Scaffold this active site. Sequence first.
Site, PDB file in Angstrom:
ATOM      1  N   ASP A  97      17.126  -3.289  32.761  1.00 11.46           N
ATOM      2  CA  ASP A  97      18.025  -2.394  31.426  1.00 11.46           C
ATOM      3  C   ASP A  97      18.448  -2.798  29.813  1.00 11.46           C
ATOM      4  O   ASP A  97      19.614  -2.531  29.450  1.00 11.46           O
ATOM      5  CB  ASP A  97      19.654  -1.363  31.733  1.00 11.46           C
ATOM      6  CG  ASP A  97      19.682  -0.642  31.917  1.00 11.46           C
ATOM      7  OD1 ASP A  97      18.463   0.140  30.945  1.00 11.46           O
ATOM      8  OD2 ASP A  97      20.420   0.660  31.687  1.00 11.46           O
ATOM      9  N   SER A 198      26.136   3.386  26.080  1.00  9.80           N
ATOM     10  CA  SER A 198      24.852   2.534  26.511  1.00  9.80           C
ATOM     11  C   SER A 198      24.489   2.056  25.793  1.00  9.80           C
ATOM     12  O   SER A 198      24.078   3.068  24.807  1.00  9.80           O
ATOM     13  CB  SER A 198      24.107   3.507  27.429  1.00  9.80           C
ATOM     14  OG  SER A 198      24.292   4.029  29.023  1.00  9.80           O
TER      15      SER A 198
END
Lengths: 245, 17
Positions: A97, A198
Amino acid sequence: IIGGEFTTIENQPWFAAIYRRHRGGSVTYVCGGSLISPCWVISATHCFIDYPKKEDYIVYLGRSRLNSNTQGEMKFEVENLILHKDYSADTLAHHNDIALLKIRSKEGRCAQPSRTIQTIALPSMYNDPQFGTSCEITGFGKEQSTDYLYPEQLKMTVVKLISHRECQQPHYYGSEVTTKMLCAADPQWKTDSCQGDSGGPLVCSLQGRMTLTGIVSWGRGCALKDKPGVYTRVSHFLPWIRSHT
Amino acid sequence: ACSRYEVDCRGRXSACG
Ligand SMILES: *Cc1cc(C*)cc(C*)c1
Ligand SMILES: [Cl-]
């Protein structure tokens, strides 16, 4: 961010606020990021994986408020949008990620250091602080898991690093956490990252240096007991970052 | 429902999946 305090960009001047533009010129927030060099912001692939066209994105540095403009902010186009070709997510965890954005103003320039804008150092390979170390996360994410709105003012909070062993317990995440991830949470479980946070930074002091130790990635719920924040472990992505940068 | 205007649509806390 659950818990924590309102801050301003001057206390986290490497924080990048990444937006998507819409056919009608409506702009909505996407995720956070971190300024690692003048032309480069690092974030999370999952933030972009559904709309991977660099042209839709705008990046602000020096910005303290979500839907209003602040004095000392600077606006950038995305020249390159680089996602990790091994990104995947089972139902909970996100693997690899991590994303890079090369930013470029309309005058064709990259960031300049000011009161509100500074770069964050990367760690050297495989160098993470010891478990127990207090680190900072920052973002415009939810203040409670159940909220439908996002705070207008930048927030931060402190969380402590958790050993893999401890994060790799059944009653935590098990082997859902890999060695290219890293866990942090509040000992009392009252403060944590959440939706909207995020791509944002997990910052630690390491060799007397403010360092990007992690990137906000995933977790079960937000500030839930035995469910720590899970962060891309930057010290294990240097080759990827050199080879794309 | 959840749209293209949604913030960090695959973030922790999100209703996706
Ligand atoms: C509704 C929606 C939106 C995104 C970006 C992702 C999922 C899974 C659902
Ligand atoms: Cl890749």
